[PDB]
Design a protein around this nucleic acid. Structure first.
Ligand code: DMA
Ligand code: DMA
Ligand code: MG
Ligand code: MG
Ligand code: MG
Ligand code: MG
Ligand code: ZN
Ligand code: ZN
Lengths: 402, 402
RNA sequence: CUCGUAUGGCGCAGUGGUAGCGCAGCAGAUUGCAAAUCUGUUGGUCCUUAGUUCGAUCCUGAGUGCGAG
RNA sequence: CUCGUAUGGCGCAGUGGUAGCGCAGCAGAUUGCAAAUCUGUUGGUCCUUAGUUCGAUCCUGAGUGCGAG
């Protein structure tokens, strides 16, 4: 009965705090899921409650990757899948905690294997793959497997390129692979959503940036700018590694109310990450695991012990005890959060493309709407209204000539 | 990949009526589950849509059994599995329905493989298995694997006996087998719960019995008593076959007011089945498939086309189209029906046994409560109150003699 | 006119001293029998009355409801 | 009292004919980069008021808040 407990949510609710209670209380090792904490030390700014608070619970896939390195999906795909191994073969229950919920796709069938195949990537194929022009690599995909071709935009470099590579290396179009995909989840899992109202969670996430300088956010980033030298690397790769952490790039140009230049920006970047996190849980995660998840009202921190702690244990208990849970799944307060309307409903289903002939971006290309709902939006945007007006307006230069 | 569309619900909405609407628009075979439709003709009373409005839709597992045969959970566990095969390899899709929701338990990993190891039980083992006394075969189980032993009552013949046979034939205790059981479901499934209010569904189920005589319920049962005469199946083989169908035993005295004797009884038996059906879906099915099911308000039959038909297609559609459904999963009206409280909550979790020393049934044995909740109930039942009262009295006289 | 019977929603057992069984109902169970099987439990205080009595559902008479020649 | 000056949520441009830019904010995508990357979009009656001009956000008269001796 390979069971696995997963804690999802925005930072500022107590995930790395609950993962501790649900650790010894049920014998488990906590795995990480932050495309930041994996980088050697440099805590505080990268968030990670002091070691003397992990209650001796062996964490995995975190604090080990070197600054002058890059962390990708695959990396976690194996490093995580691996930690689960050890934790399992040790009668201990894994507890995956993390903000990059994209990585949660590993805990269940959703990845495309691309290594066991030796499809000789002929020169002609690579030239198309490693092409400088985005539309030429797209049209190629449009031909072979036009299905998946529509699910993406002709400007989605990373995406279109990824799909074609799959068609080439595996031979079998990626459209079919998905049409007959397991989608099931490995190891019986228990998803816990430790959510918190936006307004408060925001006020907290900001006072968290303030009191973040006191703990030594200064030295943190300062010790970060130090590694910046003795190596040198222009923004050609100095914006994809530890560099992303909130506080580095903010004081980067401020080191070649001037304080606000970095303060307000930091507090902003934080919220953005949060907002997206929620979006991914609501539009991706939840819908995929078919609304099977348990919310935890973390809005009021003065009731966390009863609204998130106590509640968590109970739920987590029956989960491990192989006994069906009796918990309502979500407090009446945060009830709509799981409703199809606040989740799956926000998804996209109409992929039919649309092209506006009277509008185009800087790249010269005409605008490309995807979906009736959105195609109709463009046709109503000031943009379209203006181009359409000065169009029929530049035409009125004929009446005054004929 | 291979998908299936089950249709649960009592017998007073249109499960068979809708199983057709979908089986066509989405191309599929309607696998039956009702343990009554699986008998040569005799439909007018065993209920099963006539070929008239059949619209040439293929129906499996039904009408293939003869009056003289005892159908069980295995013959279905095989026939169904086979029927689905054909459908899956014929460019179609299984549209399973049925009334005996128990059998649907086969649509996933649950049962044990007590076939591979056809090990022969030593005389000593069989003697214990095929014992006449229920407590002696139970104590045996209490010893080897006391875990599963508590999940049952010392009077649960069929149950306790079945568990022991699993321990013997497989060697591995049934307690562990369940503690590490898949529980997952084979083939992506879509459960549709075509429910309807109790009051109305009852009024309908009864006018159903009335107009049931007109279609020829008389000849139906009459042609049933005819098969009775041959070999004249004594009350030995009268509860293991078509015999149990409504009308048979009901009108047995009408062939050895006198009309109500069978009328009221019939209408009653009907409701009983319905009530239990709902309970199984609410306490068993739903909880198991983790509240993943779609209700369909069939209370008002004047809105069926919109509340059950239209709605069903839509949901069914995205299901097959491999697109996550956007349907609210259950109309605000019938909302509590899926709530943990109206389902999983009704389950039993405290299995600790309890014995009353002042109470015993006809079998002589003392009462055996299972679970605090219920142990406390017994301690307050009139039964206990009386035995406890007439006890202190016929025991206080001794306290008087001296 | 002759005679028994006249108890939980219905069909029944039963004792001078304060009551039961099955059906139904409610409820739990269900990992080859599930329209089966198992388990628990809510309803009467014995048609009405006056007496017979230390006290009657069970005793006597009667008003009354059914069963018969 | 004499001069600067107020343009969408924040900061800035800008033209005689009825407006932009960066940043926020909102929305969609995501099956080896995801704190990435891609795509779409809502905000102002250009301070108030009165005039020359056919036209006023940009010219002129004061009007009001803000800043300057
Ligand atoms: O710890 P905390 O409240 O920041 O939450 P998390 O660990 O999820 O960032
Ligand atoms: O009778 P009915 O067809 O309306 O109900 P069911 O189809 O469930 O037997
Ligand atoms: Mg933390
Ligand atoms: Mg007396
Ligand atoms: Mg003044
Ligand atoms: Mg922006
Ligand atoms: Zn346009
Ligand atoms: Zn008792």
């Amino acid at each position: 009965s390979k069971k696995v407990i997963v804690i999802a949510g925005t930072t500022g609710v107590g995930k790395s705090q609950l993962s501790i209670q649900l650790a010894q209380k049920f014998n488990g090792e906590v795995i990480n899921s932050d495309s930041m904490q994996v980088y050697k030390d440099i805590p505080i700014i990268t968030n990670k409650h002091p070691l003397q608070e992990r209650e001796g619970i062996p964490h995995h896939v975190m604090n080990h990757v070197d600054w002058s390195e890059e962390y990708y999906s695959h990396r976690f795909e194996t490093e995580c899948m691996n930690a689960i191994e050890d934790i399992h073969r040790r009668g201990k229950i894994p507890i995956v905690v993390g903000g990059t919920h994209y990585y949660l796709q590993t805990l269940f069938n959703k990845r495309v294997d691309t290594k066991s195949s030796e499809r000789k990537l002929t020169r002609k194929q690579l030239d198309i793959l490693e092409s400088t022009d985005p539309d030429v690599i797209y049209n190629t995909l449009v031909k072979c497997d036009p299905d998946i071709a529509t699910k993406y935009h002709p400007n989605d470099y990373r995406r279109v390129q990824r799909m074609l590579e799959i068609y080439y290396k595996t031979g079998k179009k990626p459209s079919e692979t998905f049409n007959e995909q397991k989608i099931t989840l490995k190891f019986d899992t228990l998803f816990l959503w430790l959510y918190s109202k936006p307004e408060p969670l925001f006020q907290r996430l900001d006072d968290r940036v303030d009191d973040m300088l006191e703990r030594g956010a200064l030295q943190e980033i300062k010790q970060l700018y130090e590694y910046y030298s003795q190596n040198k690397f222009t923004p050609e790769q100095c914006e994809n590694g530890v560099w992303q952490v909130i506080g580095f790039k903010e004081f980067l140009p401020w080191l070649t109310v001037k304080l606000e230049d970095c303060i307000e920006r930091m507090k902003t970047r934080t919220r953005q990450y949060a907002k997206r996190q929620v979006k991914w849980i609501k539009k991706m995660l939840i819908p995929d695991i078919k609304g099977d998840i348990y919310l935890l009202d973390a809005t009021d921190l003065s009731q966390w012990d009863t609204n998130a702690s106590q509640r968590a244990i109970a739920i987590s208990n029956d989960f491990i005890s192989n006994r069906p849970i009796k918990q309502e799944r979500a407090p009446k307060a945060l009830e709509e959060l799981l409703s199809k309307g606040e989740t799956t409903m926000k998804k996209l289903d109409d992929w039919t493309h649309y092209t506006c002939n009277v509008c185009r971006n800087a790249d010269g290309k005409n605008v490309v709407a995807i979906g009736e709902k959105y195609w109709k939006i463009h046709l109503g945007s000031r943009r379209h209204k203006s181009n359409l007006k000065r169009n029929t307006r530049q035409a009125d230069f004929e009446k005054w000539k004929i």
